Structure 1
Amino acid sequence: KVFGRCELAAAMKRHGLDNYRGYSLGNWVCAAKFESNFNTQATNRNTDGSTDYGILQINSRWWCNDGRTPGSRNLCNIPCSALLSSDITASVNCAKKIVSDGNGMNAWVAWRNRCKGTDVQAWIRGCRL
């Protein structure tokens, strides 16, 4: 599914991401834009042989099992294919475990390089929420 900006913001707020671990909703919308361009089906293969999956580009080395990443830890206890669904529940639930891991949203390199320190409330401007 390719979400619209406000449609994704509403879905994220429904699933309890607004101010989750102190990160306002615009942070999450910004991270999704630059990681997947709001496309639940996005996949990208990394140099280490792992793959990133879905709207928040969750990694197969640590977080989900794709059956081709040796030594995967599968800390979210899910097949990575679950993260490509039009229903964002599985991605949100796994993202909450990632942001809680000690480094906050710095776990998403696009967030650190493109959203951190910017006016992230712009990402939710104009939306009915």
Structure 2
Amino acid sequence: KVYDRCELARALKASGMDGYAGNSLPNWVCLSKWESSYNTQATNRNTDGSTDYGIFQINSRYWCDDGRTPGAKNVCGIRCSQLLTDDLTVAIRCAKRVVLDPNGIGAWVAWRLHCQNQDLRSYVAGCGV
């Protein structure tokens, strides 16, 4: 499913993502926008054999099992396939686990590049959240 910006915002707010580990809502909308363009079925293969999965583009080397990534750890304890569903429950739960590591929201290259040290007010504007 390709989420509408405000449709996503409402779904993340409802899942407790606003302030999750000190990361306000606009941070998560900004990273979903630039990581996948709000598409839960987005996939991206890397040089090293790993693949990025879903709306938050979670890597198969540490967080999920896709059966073709060499030396993977599956810390989220899921199949990567579970990150591409229209239903965000599993993606949210894994993303929640990703920001608990020391690097936090800095784990996401799109966040560091287009959201970090920017005015993200516009990503939630008009959503009524």
Which residue of structure 1 aligns with residue 60 of structure 2?
A: 60
Which residue of structure 1 aligns with residue 127 of structure 2?
A: 127
Q: Deviations over 1:63-106 (max 9, x none)?
A: 00001002110000000000000001111100011111001111
Measure, in 2, the Cα distance between the counterparts of 1:26 and 1:11.
13
Which residue of structure 1 aligns with residue 74 of structure 2?
A: 74
Question: Given residue 43 of structure 1, which amino acid in structure 2 is its aligned partner?
Answer: T
Question: Given residue 54 of structure 2, which amino acid in structure 1 is its aligned partner?
Answer: G
Secondary structure at the aligned position of 2:78 is classed as coil
Which residue of structure 2 aligns with residue 37 of structure 1?
A: 37
Aligned-residue offset at 1:114: 0.4
Which residue of structure 2 aligns with residue 4 of structure 1?
A: 4
Aligned-residue offset at 1:121: 2.0
Measure, in 2, the Cα distance between the counterparts of 1:117 and 1:104.
15
Which residue of structure 1 aligns with residue 114 of structure 2?
A: 114
* Residue ranges of structure 1 left out of the alignment (5+ in a row): none
Percent identity reads 60
Measure, in 2, the Cα distance between the counterparts of 1:41 and 1:127.
23
Which residue of structure 1 aligns with residue 25 of structure 2?
A: 25
Aligned-residue offset at 1:128: 2.2
TM-score, length basis structure 1: 0.98
**RMSD between superposed Cα atoms in Å:** 0.6
Secondary structure at the aligned position of 2:52 is classed as strand
Measure, in 1, the Cα distance between the counterparts of 2:27 and 2:45.
24
Measure, in 1, the Cα distance between the counterparts of 2:49 and 2:83.
18
* Residue ranges of structure 2 left out of the alignment (5+ in a row): none
Question: Given residue 106 of structure 1, which amino acid in structure 2 is its aligned partner?
Answer: G
Question: Given residue 91 of structure 1, which amino acid in structure 2 is its aligned partner?
Answer: A
Which residue of structure 2 aligns with residue 90 of structure 1?
A: 90
Runs of 4 or more consecutive aligned structure 1 residues displaced over 4 Å after TM superposition: none
Measure, in 2, the Cα distance between the counterparts of 1:109 and 1:85.
23
